Amino acid sequence: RAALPRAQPRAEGPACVLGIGTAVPPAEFLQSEYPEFFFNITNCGEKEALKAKFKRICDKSGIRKRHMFLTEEVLKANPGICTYMEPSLNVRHDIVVVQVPKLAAEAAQKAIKEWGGRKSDITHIVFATTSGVNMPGADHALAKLLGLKPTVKRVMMYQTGCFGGASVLRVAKDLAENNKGARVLAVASEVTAVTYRAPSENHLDGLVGSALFGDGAGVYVVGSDPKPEVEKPLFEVHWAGETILPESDGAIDGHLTEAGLIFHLMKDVPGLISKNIEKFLNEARKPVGSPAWNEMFWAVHPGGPAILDQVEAKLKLTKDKMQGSRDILSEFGNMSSASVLFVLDQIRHRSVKMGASTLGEGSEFGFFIGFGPGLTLEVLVLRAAPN
Amino acid sequence: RAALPRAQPRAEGPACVLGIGTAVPPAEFLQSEYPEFFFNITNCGEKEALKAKFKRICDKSGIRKRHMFLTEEVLKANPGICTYMEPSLNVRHDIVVVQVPKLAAEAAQKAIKEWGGRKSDITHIVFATTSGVNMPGADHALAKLLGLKPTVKRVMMYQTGCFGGASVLRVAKDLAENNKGARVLAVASEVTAVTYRAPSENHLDGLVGSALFGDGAGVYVVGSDPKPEVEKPLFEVHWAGETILPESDGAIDGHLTEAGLIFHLMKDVPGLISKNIEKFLNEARKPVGSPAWNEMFWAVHPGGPAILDQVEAKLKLTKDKMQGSRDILSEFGNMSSASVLFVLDQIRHRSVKMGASTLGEGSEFGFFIGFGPGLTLEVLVLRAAPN
C-alpha cells in the first residue's frame, strides 16, 4: 500500500494580506443628532427618561458618526422594523439578503484592486456576517456579483457576531497555506437591519445596541507565497487561535426570533476580557519571540470604549496603540465582524501618513483581536511589512 | 528582514477519517403510514386531493422510514409548527437550539470512541446544519457538552443546505493538513423542526421536503499523520472542490422566515446535476489517476431517488455502486448535511459484511458528493483503507 504525494499541492510561505478594501453605506448619522432621530422615527418621543439614558450612552460611546442603510425613507417603507418586537424578520431579510453581499462586493472590488491580480485567480471565499442568513448564501451571491469562477471554494460563516472578522482571517490562513496559489477573499459584511428596533425599558441591551451598531464591509485578499514584484504583502499571518474565557458562560446571548436578532448581556463583557486577556496573549506571543506589549501594534475590535480602555489599562499600553481602534469606533461605530478589518487597514494608513518604518506604526508584530458570544476571544499574530 | 519558520507547524500526510459516529432521535415514522399521520396532526386531513398528491410523492420516494424529534406529543405542544404560515420561528428555535448539538454530541461520543483518542486532543470543530441559528453557535454548545478544551478552533457553517456534509470534510481537510497534531471533529446535524410545515396547495414545493426530510447527525474525527497501531485510518482525503452548475440559478432557494425555513424548488434538480456531473467529476478523478467510474466507490448525498437513478444511468455504474446511498435513503430519509456522512459509513459497513478488500466495497478511490443551493455540487475524492 503506497503513500501518495499531496494531490492538491500545498503552499510554503505564511499567508499574506495582499490588498484591503472597505465599504460603508452612503448615509451618515451624527451621534449628536441620533437620539432625536431614532426616538422620533420609532414613535418613542414620549419616553423621555429612556431617551435621556440613550443620549448619555451615545455621549459616552466614542462615536462621532455611523453609516446606516436604514435611512428615514427605508424605515418608513418598513414599519415592522421600527417597532420593538412585532414580527418583522421577513422584511428584515429582504433588505440584508441583498445588501450584505452588495456591500462586500464594493469592498472586494477595492481589495482586488490593491492586490493587483486577476479575478479568475480568486480560488476561495471566506465570509462572515451577523446580519441574516439565506440559501444560497451571501458567499454565493458575492461570487455572482464579482463574476468569480464557478469552482470558487466557499466557507460561509453566518451568525458569528463580533469575533467573526478574526475568524475569517483564521480560516483564510489555513486555506491559503494549504493550497499552492490559493487566493482567498476573507470577507466580513454587516448591515444593522436585523438588530434595529425601537427602544424599551425592558431591553437595556437594545439601547446600547442602538447606540453602537453600524454598517460596514471589509475584505482582504489573502495568499501565501506572493509573486515577488507583482504582489505586495501588507501583512503576514503567523498565528491563529481562540479560546472561551473563564467563568464567562452566558455573557452574551444572541437570539434570531420572529422579530429579528435580539441580544441580552448578563455579564461584564469588558471585565471578563480585560481580566483574562494577558494570559492568552502570553501564549500567542511565544512563536514570535515574546515582544513586550508596547512593541506590538493592536488591531482590536472596537466593541465600545469600555473594552478598549480597560485592556489598555490592564496592559499598560501607550495611548497610540489603540488610536487606530478608537478612530474606527469614532467614524463608523461597532460594525461587528467587519470592524476589526477596518481597524487594521487604519493602522496601515496611520503608518504611511506618519512615515513609520513598518505598516504597524513601526512595530514588527501585532495582534488582530475579535471577541463575541460564548465569550470567545479570537487572536491572530501578524507581522507588519516594511515601509 | 528575515523569513521565519512556520510558527504553527503544518502536518505532512493527507487528512484521514479516524472514527465515525451517527445518531438519530428514536421515534420512527414508516413512510407507508406517514401521510395519514402528517395530514391529520396538521388539521389538513381534509384536503383529499393534496393528500393523494402527497401519498404518490412518498411512494415514489424510496424511503421506508424516517427518524424525527417531532413526535405527536411535541407537535401538540407547539401548535404553531402545525400551521401553514403563522409565526412559529420562536418555538422552532426553542427545539433545534438544544437538539441539533445534543444529537451531534451523541454521534460524536461514538466517533471519538472508534478513533480511540482522548477528548483533550480535539483541536478543531467544523459544524454544518440547516436547522436554526444561534449565538453562541451549535459548535460552542457541542464543545460544552463534550467537555472539550476552551482553546478549540471552530468553524460554524449555519444554513448550508444538503451540501454541508461535504463542506465540513473539505474544511476539515485543510485544518487538519495545515496543523501538526490537529484532530478535527467534522460535524453535520439536522432536525426538521425549522422546515416542518403543514401542506398547502400554494406551497407546491413544501410537499417534496415534507416527504423526504428526516433528522440525523454525523461526525467524523479527521486528522493527518495517524499514530501507527494506535489511530487507524478508514479513509484518506485526497481532493476537495466544488462548482456551481451552469444555468441553475434559483433551483433551490431557501428563506428563513417568521414561519420558519421555506423552500422553493424552481428547476429540474436531478436533470441539472446529471447533465453536468460527469464533466466536473472527470476533473476530480485526475490527481488520483482517473480511475474508471466503476472502479470507484460512491458516497452520494441521497437527495432523492431520482437524482441517484439518473447519475447511475448517465455514468453507467454497476448497480452495487449506489446501494449505500439507497440504504441510507430507505432507512433515514434525506437528512440534509448529515446524510452523506451516513452513506460513507454505510459503505464501510457493507464492505465489512461482504469481506471486500477495501472499506469502499473493493474500490481504492471513491467520491464523497454533496449538493444543494447554488446549484452547488461539492465533491471530495477519498481513498478507502484495507480491509
Report what the structure shows.
- Chains A, B: Belongs to the thiolase-like superfamily. Chalcone/stilbene synthases family.
- Chains A, B: Its EC number is 2.3.1.74.
- Chains A, B: Pfam families: Chal_sti_synt_C, Chal_sti_synt_N.
- Chains A, B: Residues 236-385 form the Chalcone/stilbene synthase C-terminal domain.
- Chains A, B: The active site is at residue 162.
- Two copies of one chain form a homodimer.
- With 387 residues, chain A is α+β, with helices and mostly antiparallel strands.
- Chain A has two domains: 1-233, Thiolase/Chalcone synthase (Peroxisomal Thiolase, Chain A, domain 1, 3-Layer(aba) Sandwich); 234-387, Thiolase/Chalcone synthase (Peroxisomal Thiolase, Chain A, domain 1).
- Helices cover 36% and strands 22% of the residues of chain A.
- Chain A has helices spanning 34-41, 48-60, 72-77, 89-115, 138-146, 164-177, 204-212, 269-285, 305-315, 323-332, 339-354, and strands spanning 15-23, 28-30, 65-67, 124-129, 153-158, 183-190, 216-223, 235-244, 252-257, 260-265, 297-300, 365-372, 376-384.
- A nine-stranded mixed beta sheet of chain A has the order 5-4-6-7-1-8-13-12-11, with helices on both faces. Chain A has a two-stranded antiparallel sheet with strand order 2-3.
- In chain A, β12 (365-372) and β13 form a beta hairpin.
- The longest helix of chain A is centred in the N-terminal third of the chain and has 27 residues, at 89-115.
- Chains A and B meet through α4, α5, β5, α6 and β8 of A and α4, α5, β5, α6 and β8 of B.
